[PDB]
Amino acid sequence: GSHMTERRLRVLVVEDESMIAMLIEDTLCELGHEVAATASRMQEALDIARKGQFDIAIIDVNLDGEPSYPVADILAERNVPFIFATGYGSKGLDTRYSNIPLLTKPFLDSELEAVLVQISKEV
């Protein structure tokens, strides 16, 4: 039988180009997310900026050219349910997730804090 589910989530991650690409299709190969965003795009950000309903949103604002638009900047000033990564590593951003995998490095503790910190913590 194969009638089962495994929690399908979305993660619009973006920042540069190949550093966030292969780093998003390989991570899913292990978790099973349902694809979302790769590289840094102004059209996608606006979508996750107006959607406020996409599980997560990464948009580095200081790597390869801080292409995180003035919104990733704002997305950090108020923070919403999601996740983010940037040259400063969010900044203690607030959300129902709990910092989780704050990104701004060559991948490492990220995946670690990515799932070991997703306890919600007093939600």
TrEMBL record:
One of its GO terms (biological process) is phosphorelay signal transduction system. InterPro entries: Bact_response_regulator, CheY-like_superfamily, Sig_transdc_resp-reg_receiver. It comes from the Bacteria. Coiled coil: none annotated. The modification 4-aspartylphosphate is found at residue 60. PANTHER family: PROTEIN-GLUTAMATE METHYLESTERASE_PROTEIN-GLUTAMINE GLUTAMINASE 1 (PTHR44591:SF24), STRESS RESPONSE REGULATOR PROTEIN 1 (PTHR44591). This is Two-component response regulator. It comes from Rhizobium meliloti (strain 1021) (Ensifer meliloti). The lineage of its organism: Bacteria, Pseudomonadati, Pseudomonadota, Alphaproteobacteria, Hyphomicrobiales.
